[PDB]
Amino acid sequence: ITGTSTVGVGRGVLGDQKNINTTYSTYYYLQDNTRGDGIFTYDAKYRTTLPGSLWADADNQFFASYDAPAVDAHYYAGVTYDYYKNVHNRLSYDGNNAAIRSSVHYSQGYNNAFWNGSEMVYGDGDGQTFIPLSGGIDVVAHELTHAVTDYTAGLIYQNESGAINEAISDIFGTLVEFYANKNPDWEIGEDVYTPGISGDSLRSMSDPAKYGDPDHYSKRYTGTQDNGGVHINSGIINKAAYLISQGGTHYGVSVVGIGRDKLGKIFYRALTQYLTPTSNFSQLRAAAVQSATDLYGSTSQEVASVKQAFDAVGVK
């Protein structure tokens, strides 16, 4: 759409009020011209046909309940863009300011969200297992991060490389949640999962076992479901990343924490410079050690912490 940049106001899935960047041309569209080549939010109208219609509103006020998921998908994609730009100096997912597109109200009672190789898609949930998925900043960042991976390491979505792909997305979605200071934690999807039960989440980085996921390589899923356990085995890596950041003793192995900022820096460098499509857990270990070496020196505490972390989870 060609028009005048303006700012509207709306309420998100959680009932929070926010300002969003809009474009005016007869109607007010969910098109943010201030970030790269734009952030565009579409209405999929309960259908599966993508992307759907660019979101149009008559008065620049997004307070209807049907508006909620679109407000959050559009605002949270802005925050994620900002995190990548400000923190890692990367312009959009491809590093060249590619337009970011999201579709909301996809299908009926769809309990998932995903990156389809070209755009983000968000279900509205069935109302009990989930509420609209765009209401979780970690979910939005998890998804956008799959775009980043796609354009850099290109990790195949299966087995070890796929679990690495999932872990990266969980790591960066959690860093974006801390970055926005939106009640941050080391859990995934807490804000949108089981609106009736308090205190739970989809996955835990601090304690993957809480939900049955492995926290050690010896406990790794060797089967066939979930593409060889891409969402299961990511727990071994998520735990390694939580220990590098925060520290702790795990299976008797002690890790001194180096904090979140360094964890983001070492992971981004491993991602963009050393990982390949078919990298396995042992290769991620070498890639992380080499990044921390590049950045802090071979004899740094940072490098020492990365080794301890992987030894704590049985990776190498």
Query: Which listed option, Zn ion, Ca ion, none, makes contact with residue 213 (CB within 5 to 8 Å by class)?
Result: none
Of the pair 61, 218, the CB lying nearest Ca ion is at 61
Residue 257 and residue 301: Cα distance in Å, rounded? 9
What residue number has its CB nearest to Zn ion?
Answer: 169
CB 281 within 8 A of CB 269: no
Query: Which listed option, Ca ion, Zn ion, none, makes contact with residue 302 (CB within 5 to 8 Å by class)?
Result: none
DSSP letters spanning 260-293: HHHHHHHHHHIIIII--TT--HHHHHHHHHHHHH
Work out whether 128 is an interface residue with Ca ion (CB under 5 A). Answer: no
Give the E-state strand segments of the chain in sequence order.
Answer: 4-11, 17-25, 27-29, 31-32, 39-43, 53-54, 56-57, 61-62, 100-106, 113-115, 120-123, 187-188, 203-204, 248-250, 253-255
Q: Is 119 a catalytic residue?
A: no
- The encoded tokens of residue 99 equal 């337009």
For tokens 């983000």, name the residue.
120
Query: Which listed option, Zn ion, Ca ion, none, makes contact with residue 160 (CB within 5 to 8 Å by class)?
Result: none
Indicate which single residue of 61, 108, 282, 301 sits in contact with Ca ion (rule: CB under 5 A).
Answer: 61
Work out whether 183 is an interface residue with Ca ion (CB under 5 A). Answer: yes
The minimum distance between CB 19 and Zn ion, in angstroms, equals 29
Residue 168 and residue 188: Cα distance in Å, rounded? 13
Which candidate in 74, 88, 105, 143 is catalytic? 143
Q: Which amino acid appears at position 65 of this protein?
A: S
Query: Which listed option, Zn ion, Ca ion, none, makes contact with residue 169 (CB within 5 to 8 Å by class)?
Result: Zn ion
The minimum distance between CB 199 and Ca ion, in angstroms, equals 7
Query: Which listed option, Ca ion, Zn ion, none, makes contact with residue 185 (CB within 5 to 8 Å by class)?
Result: Ca ion
Of the pair 178, 310, the CB lying nearest Ca ion is at 178
Of the pair 22, 169, the CB lying nearest Zn ion is at 169
- Which of 307, 296, 220, 298 has its CA nearest to residue 265? 296
Of the pair 94, 200, the CB lying nearest Ca ion is at 200
For tokens 């509103």, name the residue.
57
Task: Please tell me what DSSP assigns to residue 308.
Answer: H
Q: Is 143 a catalytic residue?
A: yes
Of the pair 169, 245, the CB lying nearest Zn ion is at 169
Indicate which single residue of 169, 234, 245, 290 sits in contact with Zn ion (rule: CB under 5 A).
Answer: 169
What is the gyration radius of the CA atoms in the chain, in angstroms?
20
What residues from 93 to 152 belong to the interface with Zn ion (CB under 5 A)? none
Residue 214 and residue 207: Cα distance in Å, rounded? 9
Name the phi and psi angles at 24, rounded to 5: -105, 125
53: three-class secondary structure by DSSP: strand
Residue 197 assigned ligand-binding role: yes
Please enumerate, by residue number, every residue annotated as part of a binding site for Ca(2+): 57, 59, 61, 138, 177, 183, 185, 187, 190, 193-194, 197, 200
Q: Which residues bind Ca ion (CB under 5 A)?
A: 57, 59, 61, 138, 177, 183, 185, 187, 193-194, 197, 200
User: Any idea which residues carry the catalytic annotation?
Assistant: 143, 231
List residues near Zn ion by CB under 5 A.
169
